[PDB]
């Protein structure tokens, strides 16, 4: 439909790997699998592999996976699409699911091209014996996906990656390797893993002082992977509010201390394995 | 109009590129193509042919693949269809989509068709209290009569496939419609794994200086699709160290790579 | 002049008759009790001036011997016969369904006398509705009246319907009543003596066999159906065909009978 | 023009003494219809409109139709037999326009009224109407709901209907400004049942006299209409004879039979 | 009208805090845009009805003037729609000619449908159109004194699209007032009508219970009328007492034993 002809926004644009930290081995666990078929496919035929098809992520949210989901675009130069696992459903049955056939074919007509898919727990149920009058609809919507990646319809030269914040509840029939041949967990990293992420913001904006991290980051055993971009701007957010438009390591402290407890009052909800 | 497939494509696999499940590699044969090829020999005795079947099991285990080589060896007309597209926006598009496929089969017969998954459109009760979930049942009823109503065909019958085999009506699960059911269990019996590893492995590069029994007897509760992953991943235990042909410890480094995740999920606070 | 297209369903019989319908001889005796009256002394009840019976339902478990009667009965018709398979839910252009049915009789009114047929109106059957469900319930609402109060003086005059379903206890009570129906008759499973006949009859064309007492199998086998037993009659040949002896044996019946249900098979007897 | 074949003119058969013996409502239509037009000045003697419209409650297989079969001669005037299934169209506005015209002939057919059945297609108190289609079905209601009451000066008409269940389906359209009253059929009393059936078999042999008065009982809440079935089931049982001969036991074999299909409850608490 | 910033009470705490989040969208690009750091492109926020959020919204435009045209999602609900969804996308380059004018959308998204599934009907064209009008837009630190935005009923129910929460997440629950606040609000709504001063709202200020801001406007507009309901040009001020309970009327009918 034209809606498939709308999602594709930034199919190429490179935001490379230097702008990331903490994940120097997951990407070593992932630059391995994806690019190689799409760089040097005869190796798996040099050696005799049924090549992979499917990957995902897991770990708590606001952590940097979606960046990785696009950071590979920079390496390839090749194509990409972004899409959720939510804005699919509608009233008319099948119309939600027909789209799935509309799109994998749409991959085949122009590639190297791959797929992303958020929040798949919505399409991530265990097929129940009993049900409501309608919740089985997504289950029949699901299994098309369960089919098309490994169905009777053979496939090659396209890839899917998905992600959740709730690995459980999933139909194991999805988790059959062949439908996705490697997993990974992205955690909240260690302090140093939390430290490159801290400085990349300073790497862009006008720094003024010396390092002054190791004790600042002593507080950094609580944060997520994404509250710090807020923290980074939040320092200059009110370093300037005194009309002092040349930032300091004096003012972030009031910020970085502040965020922790306003984050505390509705934080640490769950972790999902 | 619904579609049909010849030689534009095929699945590009074989009986020889698969192995194990050998008793299922013959029950399927006698139902489908031998009647199509060798007819007289049992029309010597003229019993009605057996017909299309079901085949279930846990997810994977080749529940979906075994078709693919016999499909390559069909010598008749054949399809590429699954279940959850029969539904349509409008009402009568569904049943109208499906009456003609048998006409398409019969217009091209003798032939046979297939489904990759059906449990969405086949349940015990033909539930009643919603304007939607009856219109699926109509898709069930119509084949249930087109299968073995009046004067169906010469063909063999709609080949099922599932992850489960209890949810759905007995009216479909009985002779004249599903004259054979099949299980695909793995069980990790040692009679066959010592082949099918080798089957999957013989096709692919392999160092003849390497262990292989380091894991077979060492692991006993296994499935059929995952195992490709370890001897998929074995290669990936190599090139990370830019090695160009595998080594023995790759499998041992791989043995717990895919399997060993035995049990840690809230052990103490499970029930007590 | 000539009628509408969709009524091609008026058409010849298949190959069947009252030899191949054994066992339930009293049932079939009834289903012509609704047929011999208006024809063999139509003036029996008419010149006795009694009343005129009309169409009927026949139900039961799946695969009990419904349909073959419904077709074989046409073989011995002396009248005209039609067909449906759930196509009445051609619901795009909603009123067309109502158009579809009103045409269905007037044609037969043109061609009366003509017994007619339905099968698995379990699809159409119910009326309990709160927020959604319509778009077909019209078409039950109309046929119910299509037999009454506008044509009812002659609606069910000489048209003599029947109907074949499962699950009589879910659809409307409006329909089963003496209005529009006479006899909610019933097909149970067979008896031990019944099953021998029904095993002896699909057993016809097999072979110049010998050394058989084909009833003790029935004593091996409880009430299952008089429909599945062709099943065990089938693969008995296949099991010998599997080893090429065209000649048969009792040994295979002992086998194939156990083929079906022993694999189609919880000590919490808290009750006494 | 469009409804000339829909325009009934048939002279059906049914009448009183062909009725089974209801009394308690045979009048009340003549109240509804007859006393109005027979002598409408008495309306003025009372100073009123003699009433309009009528709906039948849920009495499936009770006589919810037969009075329409009854009136057809005692009516002594014109009449129509319409029904709701016909209203609905392969196109959009071609339906509701119908209701506007068909009253004109009804205007032309001044001492002419109609029976309707099957209105449960229409009377529906749930109009989310997600589509564009059933919005027309709502449009099929409005003009008629309008055409009914939008018509005043019902000096002659009686626009009436009936069904088998209303208490969960029909709108709150009810208003004496639109529809006045509503009258019920349901299962009979014993002496009510007693009026029913010898009169049927009055046109039938009774080879022997078999004291039917002790045959049935109020405890078995029969339909009103398993009994013509009864009356013919036995001759069917003589259709299971060469003898064309009447017997009580045949009725005995029938009610035992037909009620083997009919429901039965547990007398668990002996309540 | 050009009513003041406040018009609401003594809520200097929020507003004097709030627009500090809008100075950078308003101005300060000298080192901000030389720092290039994040810029909330429309401070969308929340708080259920009852508040003067429209007033806090509109009164903030007292400094950043804005023409009186502010059309919402119920303009975006028609037959074969999309020309309305065209309108929204053109809405800003339209205004981007020369204007610190900024309109104020308003969203009760699933106030027409249900929410039994969290997977929700994040409305069709808003969820689409909101992106381009937000992704490809800057303010230039002059003639874009604020950034167009909206607000909603309850921050639990939304399908956050790309950058729906990426940057534009500046948001506060307006803390409902207290007795020191309240009595000076209802003072405002009597600035046009004077009465017997024998009992201040400060006398009332302990008598209030569970009163949000909007419905308090339904106090003196009636209780000013309940006086002249008995035609006293001298407005009494106990009519509040028997009128405040007219919020729901109490079904007060002949208290038997009480």
């Amino acid at each position: 439909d034209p809606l498939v002809y709308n999602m594709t926004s930034f199919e190429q644009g490179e935001i490379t790997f230097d702008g990331i930290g903490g994940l120097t081995e997951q990407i070593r666990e992932l630059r391995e699998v994806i690019e190689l078929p799409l760089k040097n496919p005869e190796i798996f035929q040099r050696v005799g592999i049924k090549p992979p098809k499917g990957v995902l992520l897991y770990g708590p949210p606001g952590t940097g996976k979606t960046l990785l989901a696009k950071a590979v675009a920079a390496t390839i130069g090749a194509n990409f699409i972004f899409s959720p696992a939510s804005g699919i459903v509608d009233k008319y049955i099948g119309e939600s699911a027909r789209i799935i056939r509309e799109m994998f074919a749409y991959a085949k007509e122009h590639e190297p091209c791959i797929i992303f898919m958020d929040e798949v727990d919505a399409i991530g149920g265990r097929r129940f014996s009993e049900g409501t009058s309608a919740d089985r609809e997504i289950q029949r919507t699901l299994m098309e996906l369960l089919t098309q990646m490994d169905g009777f319809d053979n496939l090659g030269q396209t890839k899917i990656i998905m992600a959740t914040n709730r690995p459980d509840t999933l139909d194991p029939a999805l988790l059959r390797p062949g439908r996705l041949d490697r997993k990974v967990e992205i955690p909240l990293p260690n302090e140093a893993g939390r430290l490159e992420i801290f400085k990349i913001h300073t790497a862009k904006v006008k720094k003024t002082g010396e390092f002054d991290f190791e004790a600042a980051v002593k507080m950094s055993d609580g944060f997520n992977g994404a509250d710090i971009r807020n923290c980074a701007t939040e320092a200059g957010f009110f370093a300037i509010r005194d009309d002092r438009d040349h930032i300091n390591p004096d003012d972030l402290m009031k910020a970085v201390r502040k965020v922790a407890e306003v984050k505390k009052l509705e934080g640490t909800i769950e972790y999902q394995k | 109009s619904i579609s049909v497939m010849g030689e534009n494509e095929k699945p590009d696999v074989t009986y020889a590129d698969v192995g194990g499940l050998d008793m299922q590699k013959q029950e399927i044969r006698e139902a489908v193509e031998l009647p199509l090829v060798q007819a007289d020999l049992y029309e010597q005795i003229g019993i009605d042919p057996p017909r299309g079947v079901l085949l279930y099991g846990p997810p994977g285990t080749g529940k979906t693949m075994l078709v693919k080589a016999v499909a390559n060896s069909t010598k008749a007309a054949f399809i590429r269809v699954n279940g959850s597209e029969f539904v349509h926006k409008y009402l009568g598009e569904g049943p109208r989509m499906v009456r003609d496929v048998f006409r398409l089969a019969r217009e091209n017969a003798p032939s046979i068709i297939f489904i990759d998954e059906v449990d969405s459109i086949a349940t015990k009760r033909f539930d009643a209290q919603t304007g939607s979930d009856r219109e699926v049942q109509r898709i069930l009823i119509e084949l249930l009569t087109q299968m073995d109503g009046f004067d169906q065909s010469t063909n063999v019958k709609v080949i099922m496939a599932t992850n489960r085999a209890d949810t759905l009506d007995p009216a479909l699960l009985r002779p004249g419609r599903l004259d054979r059911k099949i299980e695909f269990p793995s069980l990790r019996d040692r009679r066959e794994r010592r082949l099918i590893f080798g089957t999957i492995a013989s096709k692919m590069s392999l160092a003849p200086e390497a262990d292989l029994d380091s894991l077979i007897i060492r692991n006993d509760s296994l499935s059929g699709a995952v195992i490709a992953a370890i001897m998929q991943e074995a290669g990936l235990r190599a090139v990370r160290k830019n090695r160009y042909v595998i080594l023995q410890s790759d499998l041992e480094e791989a043995y717990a790579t895919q399997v060993k995740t035995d049990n840690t999920v809230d052990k103490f606070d499970f029930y007590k | 002049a000539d009628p509408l297209v969709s009524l091609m369903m008026v058409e010849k019989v298949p190959d069947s008759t009252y030899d191949m319908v054994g066992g339930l001889t009293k049932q079939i005796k009834e289903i012509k009790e609704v047929i011999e009256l208006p024809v063999k002394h139509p003036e029996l009840f008419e010149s006795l001036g009694i009343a005129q019976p009309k169409g009927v339902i026949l139900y039961g478990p799946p695969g009990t011997g419904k349909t073959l009667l419904a077709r074989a009965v046409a073989h011995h018709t002396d009248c005209k016969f039609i067909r449906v398979s759930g196509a009445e839910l051609v619901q795009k252009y909603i009123g067309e369904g109502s158009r579809m049915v009103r045409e269905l009789f007037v044609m037969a009114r043109e061609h009366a006398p003509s017994i007619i047929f339905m099968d698995e109106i379990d699809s159409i059957g119910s009326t309990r509705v709160e927020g959604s469900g319509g778009g077909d319930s019209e078409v039950q609402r109309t046929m119910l009246e299509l037999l009454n109060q506008l044509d009812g003086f002659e609606t069910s005059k000489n048209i003599k319907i029947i109907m074949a379903t499962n699950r009589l206890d879910i659809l409307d009570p409006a329909l089963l009543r003496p209005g529009r129906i006479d006899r909610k008759i019933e097909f149970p499973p067979p008896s031990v003596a019944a099953r021998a006949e029904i095993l002896r009859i699909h057993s016809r064309k097999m072979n110049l066999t010998r050394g058989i007492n084909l009833r003790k199998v029935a004593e091996k086998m409880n009430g299952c159906s008089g429909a599945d037993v062709k099943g065990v009659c089938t693969e008995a040949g296949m099991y010998a065909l599997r080893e090429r002896r065209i000649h048969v044996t009792q040994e295979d019946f002992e086998l194939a009978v156990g083929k079906v249900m022993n694999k189609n098979q919880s000590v919490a007897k808290l009750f006494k | 023009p469009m409804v000339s074949v829909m325009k009934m003119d048939k002279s059906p058969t049914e009448s009183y003494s062909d009725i089974g013996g209801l009394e308690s409502q045979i009048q009340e239509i003549k109240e509804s219809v007859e006393l109005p037009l027979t002598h409408p000045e008495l309306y003025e003697e009372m100073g009123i409109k003699p009433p309009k419209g009528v709906i039948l409650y849920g009495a499936p297989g009770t006589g919810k139709t037969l009075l329409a079969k009854a009136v057809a001669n005692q009516t002594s005037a014109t009449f129509l037999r319409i029904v709701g299934s016909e209203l609905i169209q392969k196109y959009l506005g071609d339906g509701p326009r119908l209701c506007r015209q068909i009253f004109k002939v009804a205007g032309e057919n001044a001492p002419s009224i109609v029976f309707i059945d099957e209105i449960d297609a229409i009377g529906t108190k749930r109009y989310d109407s997600n589509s564009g289609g059933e919005r027309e079905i709502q449009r099929t209601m409005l003009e008629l709901l309008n055409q009914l009451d939008g018509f005043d000066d019902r000096g002659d008409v009686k626009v009436i209907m009936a069904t088998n269940k209303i208490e969960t389906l029909d709108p709150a359209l009810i208003r004496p400004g639109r529809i006045d009253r509503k009258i019920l059929f349901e299962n009979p009393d014993l002496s009510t049942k007693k009026k029913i059936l010898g009169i049927h078999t009055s046109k039938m042999n009774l080879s022997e006299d078999v004291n039917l008065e002790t045959l049935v009982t109020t405890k078995d809440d029969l339909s009103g209409a398993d009994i013509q079935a009864m009356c013919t089931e036995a001759g069917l049982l003589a259709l299971r004879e060469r003898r064309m001969q009447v017997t009580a036991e045949d009725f005995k074999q029938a009610k035992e039979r037909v009620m083997k299909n009919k429901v039965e409850e547990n007398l668990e608490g002996l309540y | 009208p050009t009513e003041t910033y406040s018009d609401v009470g003594g809520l200097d705490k929020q507003i004097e805090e709030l627009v500090e989040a809008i100075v950078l969208p308003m101005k300060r690009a000298d080192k901000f845009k030389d720092m290039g750091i994040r810029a909330p492109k429309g401070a969308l926020m929340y708080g259920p009805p009852g508040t003067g959020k429209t007033l806090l919204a509109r009164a903030c435009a007292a400094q950043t003037n804005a023409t009186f045209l502010k059309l919402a999602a119920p303009q975006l609900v028609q037959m074969y729609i999309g020309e309305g969804a065209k309108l929204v996308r053109d809405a800003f380059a339209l205004a981007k000619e020369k204007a610190p004018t900024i309109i104020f959308i308003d969203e009760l998204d699933a106030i027409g449908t249900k929410r039994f599934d969290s997977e929700k009907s994040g409305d069709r064209e808003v969820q689409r159109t909101m992106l381009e009008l937000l992704n490809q837009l800057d303010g230039f630190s002059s003639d874009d004194r604020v950034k167009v935005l909206a607000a909603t009923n309850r921050v639990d129910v939304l399908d956050p699209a790309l950058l729906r929460s990426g940057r534009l997440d500046r948001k506060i629950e307006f803390p409902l007032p207290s007795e020191d606040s309240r009595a000076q609000i209802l003072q405002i709504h009597s600035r046009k009508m004077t009465t017997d001063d024998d009992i201040n709202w400060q006398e009332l200020a302990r008598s209030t219970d569970e009163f949000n801001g909007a419905q308090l406007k339904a106090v003196t507009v009636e209780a000013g009328m309940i006086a002249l309901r008995n035609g006293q040009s001298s407005v009494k001020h106990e009519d509040f007492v028997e009128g405040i309970s007219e919020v729901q009327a109490r079904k007060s009918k002949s208290v038997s034993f009480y």
Binding site: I93, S133 | Y90 | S132 | - | -
Partner: peptide, 12 residues
Amino acid sequence: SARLGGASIAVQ
């Protein structure tokens, strides 16, 4: 027109 009404949908 060149059509009439016909549809189906879920409820929740």
